[PDB]
Design a protein around this nucleic acid. Structure first.
Ligand SMILES: [Mg+2]
Ligand SMILES: [Mg+2]
Ligand SMILES: [Mg+2]
Ligand SMILES: [Mg+2]
Ligand SMILES: [Mg+2]
Ligand SMILES: [Mg+2]
Lengths: 64, 274, 113, 113, 93, 348
RNA sequence: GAAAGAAUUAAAUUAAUAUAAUGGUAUAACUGUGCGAUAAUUGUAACACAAACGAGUGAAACAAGUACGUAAGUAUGGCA
RNA sequence: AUAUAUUUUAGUAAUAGAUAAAAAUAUGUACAGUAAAAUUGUAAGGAAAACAAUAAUAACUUUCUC
């Protein structure tokens, strides 16, 4: 399995949720879409937990 | 996207709408780079350019006098030939490519007071081939170039891929810098006076060197770069040093005219001319 | 043995509506792969470059001098109009709505915001 | 973390870079800005005038040459032919050097070869 | 294998805010082989330089106007033409 | 020294501020700029070095050039050429540049920016071409106010409108704005700023506000509607605000009827057009023209036909666009217009 | 007569298009860049194309909300 | 000139241009531009690394000038 399915649950606690597909070790996928219960654009976040390909956090502060 | 169909609608007025001016997005960018109010401002005409002044005074008149040929008409270049309409298949046919060449060549004009040959631009291409191993060598080469010129270099990247030479695609390898105006003139003057005399056995720029149309070139070894005064002043700061190609671009119609112009600026020419 | 016995069906990609033909809004005038015909006057274009009618009218195929080397399909609002329409003349427009003579309906419409 | 060679490369890079080496922006008062504009415009005009003068002079020289060569053609054909030759490999003499800022110790050489 | 300097996140130069690279330059006097001085702008900090080998003392640039050296130095008392004439019998070859 | 002389030359070419003028013309960089009002900021400020002597030299150079131009300018007889010469003479004057750049062009005070002066007028034209004219052209093309009403425009005069009498607030209308029915309830005010050399005494103007987007249900299309029509208006380069003060009741060929868009009829373009009169020779004074008031109709109005009849040339334009809101019924009631129709939401 | 600009004409889609092949594409659908990361949104979708049914395709419009754009507008994933 | 204290600098790192066919964010929108091949050259460079150059200006606008 290369591309897995996930459940994005609305942040405005309606219960509304949208499902999308991602690569197995993709970053946490949050997106702003229309919640029809609330009748506005709200944040969606992943309901379940899963492991991620850990990227090194690129440093803008010039280290050393 | 509902469609990909690109189709610019016609208008009902002849006023030229500059779309950039109607926005309020880039207020600093609306000013010209020549204007003092722009952050892109730079003092251009800071001091009197010496080589340019010399060209203006002595050389330009002499060059004009040399290049006068009596009742010389225009020599048209090789162009795309049209088909004779001796068949109905010629009717929307693309034109035959030029006689010898695949690309079209320019018309050679007679030299008059307007179109006298002169220096247009210098380009200093330095592609260091050891930088396929070491990226830091490209940086050092760029610095060297900057030191030599007093102008900001631009990084060269490997455009191609090849196995025989250990060369990848998209790898920073040396640098280039297009000099124009006064900095270019200075660089030429330094080349004539300081550097090219300190090369021991140098006859000259080859007479077989050049473009077909007003462009002459030559190159300096890593040994030759140690004579540049910014390099020359400190041997110690530069352990390594890289060769370079030097593309001189003139406003000359043909290459012999360009060679003559360069000779006027004290560039020696040795080989048998074409 | 090994045989090359495999092929897709034909995509039905002719002109679906012809010159002088009455059209309705939404109707497909052309199915095509890339713009062989460009969407002209009173005519839209889809994802599959399908020309469709935006208004009720008469399908017309034409060339426009503004776009040489490009064939167009547009919809004239009547049969009288030469559909490469004159440039500086005013655009023939359709109002396409009806007034609510019925009082209740009009009142409802006024209320609705 | 980094080698001495890496450090020296970084230093070299810094020399070229605009990172923390450049001053504040050149702000002006409106009167000062105007004064600057008037300085620049006048200068540009002067430069244009100079260009025209030089260009005019060159044109005049060209006309004189043309006048001469026609006369030569009229009078002595051989002399005209001699004048009008291809000067393809003509090289400026190496003594005609680009005038320096200040003159040398020996200004002029009276003997040669 | 490939020696590199790994890039940090690039600093966003905004459109209009880009400034031209005016490098620090000193006015440097070059005295050539002869006493002709010329001013040139230069990035290295040295107000005056005097040059030894230039176009103004090279024969290529003015036609009209060290083993051998070592040999000359260490065979100087003898003074090594007359010497050629003495040591050049052309019978044997 | 021609630019210090004000015997024949207008007062507007000088800077009216004394301090600013003094700062401009001094022998050393001793004084501090009048623009910087605050003491601490003045202290902080440092002008670029050597600027004074060079500036003075530049002034002398351009002053000499101006003087030379003036030598030609007075000998010239034909008016447009003379004006061009005058412009050439004074355009590089620092004082006039200061005046123009840093003071308002829209509501110009005559002593600072005089549009009677040719140079200032040229500057104003150039400024208009740089932004406002282009914008206007874009709004005419995009909204389709040109081909729908009047084929083309060659923008000559800068036209700005205002609605002072309705609400109370001061705002010049940006072309292609959505104005409320309250805002456009009472009539607008025009300002036709002319930049070409024109006979101020003789040249009359007409102003027509036209609504191309009123629905005609017999035709199943739209028709035009002359919402406001003025004729024979006198403009002057500085005195150019067309207000009930200026124009008389005789000038009003069709008195202002407000935008009253119907519900679901859509967005309605109101595109004011400014024409200049045809100028007749061998006749002193302003040549009037009579309009057949029974012939021209307001509920349906061929603008192009009207223009053809009276031999007009459209020099300027401006546009707003109104759509239905709650107060249009109130506006109708105030004006005594009928209840107003209501259309279906669907364009079936 | 010269400089600069606006450009126009000719040629080109042989490169490039995430990917086969075909059609299309410089008016670019190709490429660069700012913002953004939203429309790779939510309910009704007529009418067409295609079509035995099951399905498939283009899609005006109405309503809710979002992003970019001075605006006109564009976006209901990708040139097809 | 030198001592202490209090600060300030030095973390030295690339784009400086709306960048435009080296490589990199493949869906939105706004603004802008044009590729390729072949040819003539140029330090190592060679058929094959990089850089340069290679169709036409009639008319128009502005600027300077005879
Ligand atoms: Mg098939
Ligand atoms: Mg193809
Ligand atoms: Mg069917
Ligand atoms: Mg079916
Ligand atoms: Mg796309
Ligand atoms: Mg694609």
């Amino acid at each position: 399995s290369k591309n897995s399915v996930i459940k994005l649950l609305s942040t405005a606690a309606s219960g509304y949720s949208r499902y999308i597909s991602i690569k197995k070790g993709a970053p946490l996928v949050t997106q702003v879409r229309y919640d029809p219960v609330v009748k506005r654009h709200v944040l969606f976040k992943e309901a379940k937990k899963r492991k991620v390909a850990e990227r090194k956090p690129l440093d803008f502060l010039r280290t050393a | 996207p509902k469609s990909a169909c690109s189709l610019v609608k016609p208008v009902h007025h002849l006023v030229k709408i500059d779309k950039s001016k109607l926005s309020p997005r880039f207020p600093e960018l609306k000013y010209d780079k020549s204007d003092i109010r722009s952050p892109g401002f730079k003092p251009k005409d800071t001091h009197a350019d010496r080589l340019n002044d010399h060209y203006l005074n002595t050389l330009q008149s002499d060059l004009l006098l040399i290049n006068y040929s009596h009742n010389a008409a225009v020599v048209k270049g090789l162009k795309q030939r049209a088909w004779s309409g001796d068949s109905p298949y010629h009717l929307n046919r693309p034109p035959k490519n030029p006689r010898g060449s695949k690309a079209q060549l320019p018309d050679i004009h007679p030299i008059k007071w307007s179109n006298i040959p002169g220096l247009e631009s210098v380009v200093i291409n330095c592609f260091v081939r050891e930088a396929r191993e070491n990226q830091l060598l490209a940086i050092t080469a760029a610095l060297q170039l900057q030191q030599i010129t007093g102008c900001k270099p631009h990084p060269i990247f490997s455009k191609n891929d090849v196995p025989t030479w250990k060369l990848r695609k998209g790898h920073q390898m040396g640098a280039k810098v297009e000099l124009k105006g006064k900095e270019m003139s200075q660089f030429l003057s330094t080349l004539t006076e300081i550097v090219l005399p300190r090369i021991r056995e140098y006859k000259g720029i080859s007479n077989q060197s050049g473009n077909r149309f007003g462009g002459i070139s030559f190159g300096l070894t890593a040994e030759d770069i140690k004579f540049f005064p910014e390099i020359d002043a400190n041997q110690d700061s530069w352990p390594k040093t890289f060769g370079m190609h030097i593309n001189i671009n003139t406003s000359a119609q043909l290459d012999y005219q360009a060679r003559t112009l360069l000779s006027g600026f004290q560039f020696p020419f040795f080989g048998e001319e074409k | 043995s090994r045989t090359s016995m495999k092929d897709s069906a034909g995509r039905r990609l002719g002109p679906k509506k012809y010159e002088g033909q009455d059209v309705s809004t939404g109707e497909i005038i052309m199915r095509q792969r890339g713009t062989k015909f460009y969407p002209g006057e009173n005519v839209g274009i889809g994802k599959d470059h399908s020309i469709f009618a935006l208004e009720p009218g008469v399908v017309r195929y034409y060339l426009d001098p503004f776009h040489p080397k490009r064939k167009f399909i547009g919809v004239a609002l009547r049969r009288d109009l030469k559909l490469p329409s004159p440039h500086f003349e005013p655009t023939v427009r359709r109002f396409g709505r009806f007034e609510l003579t019925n009082k209740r309906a009009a009142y409802k419409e006024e209320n609705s915001i | 973390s980094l080698s001495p060679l890496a450090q020296r490369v970084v230093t070299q890079l810094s020399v070229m870079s605009a990172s923390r080496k450049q001053p504040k922006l050149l702000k002006l008062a409106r009167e000062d800005l105007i004064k600057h504009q008037t300085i620049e415009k006048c200068w540009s005009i002067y430069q244009q005038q100079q260009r025209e003068r030089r260009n005019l002079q060159l044109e005049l020289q060209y006309k004189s040459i043309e006048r001469s060569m026609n006369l030569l053609q009229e009078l002595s054909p051989r002399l005209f032919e001699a004048a009008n030759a291809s000067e393809k490999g003509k090289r400026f003499p190496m003594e005609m050097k680009v005038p320096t800022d200040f003159p040398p110790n020996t200004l002029w050489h009276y003997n040669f070869r | 294998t490939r020696i590199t300097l790994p890039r940090r996140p690039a600093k966003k130069i905004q459109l209009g805010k880009s400034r031209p690279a005016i490098y620090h330059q000193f006015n440097v006097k070059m005295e050539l082989s002869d006493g002709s001085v010329v001013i040139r702008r230069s990035q290295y900090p040295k107000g005056e330089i005097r040059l030894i080998q230039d176009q103004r003392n090279n024969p290529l640039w003015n036609p009209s106007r060290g083993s051998l050296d070592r040999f000359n130095k260490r065979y100087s008392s003898l003074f090594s033409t007359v010497e050629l004439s003495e040591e050049n019998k052309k019978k044997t070859q | 020294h021609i630019w210090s002389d004000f015997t024949t030359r207008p007062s507007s070419l000088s800077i009216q501020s004394s301090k600013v003028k003094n700062y401009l013309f001094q022998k050393k960089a001793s004084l501090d700029p009048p623009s910087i009002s605050r003491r601490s900021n003045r202290i902080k400020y440092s002008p670029p070095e050597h600027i004074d002597e060079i500036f003075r030299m530049s002034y002398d150079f351009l002053e000499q050039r101006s003087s030379k131009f003036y030598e030609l300018a007075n000998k010239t007889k034909n008016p447009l050429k003379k004006d061009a010469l005058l412009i050439k003479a004074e355009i590089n004057n620092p004082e006039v540049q200061y005046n123009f750049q840093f003071n308002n062009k829209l509501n110009n005070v005559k002593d600072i920016i005089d549009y009677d002066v040719p140079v200032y007028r040229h500057l104003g034209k150039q400024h208009w071409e740089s932004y406002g004219q282009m914008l206007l052209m874009q709004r005419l093309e995009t909204l389709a106010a040109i081909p729908d009403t009047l084929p083309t425009l060659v923008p000559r005069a800068e036209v700005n409108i205002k609605f002072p009498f309705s609400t109370g607030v001061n705002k010049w209308i940006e072309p292609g704005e959505f104005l409320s029915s309250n805002v456009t309830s009472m009539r607008p005010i025009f300002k036709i700023q002319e930049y070409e050399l024109v006979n101020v005494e003789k040249q009359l103007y007409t102003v027509l506000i036209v609504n191309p987007d009123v629905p005609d249900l017999s035709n199943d299309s739209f028709k035009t509607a002359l919402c406001y029509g003025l004729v024979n208006i006198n403009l002057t380069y500085n005195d150019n605000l067309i207000d009930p003060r200026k124009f008389h009741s005789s000038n009003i060929i069709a008195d202002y009827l407000p935008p009253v868009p119907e519900k679901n009829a859509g967005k309605q373009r109101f595109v004011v057009w400014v024409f200049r009169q045809p100028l007749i020779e061998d006749k002193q004074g302003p040549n009037m023209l009579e309009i057949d008031r029974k012939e021209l109709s307001r509920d349906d109005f061929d603008i192009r036909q009207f223009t053809k009849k009276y031999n007009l040339t459209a020099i300027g334009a401006h546009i707003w666009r109104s759509e239905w809101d709650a107060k249009v019924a109130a506006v109708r009631e105030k004006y005594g217009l009928p209840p107003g129709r209501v259309f279906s939401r669907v364009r079936r």
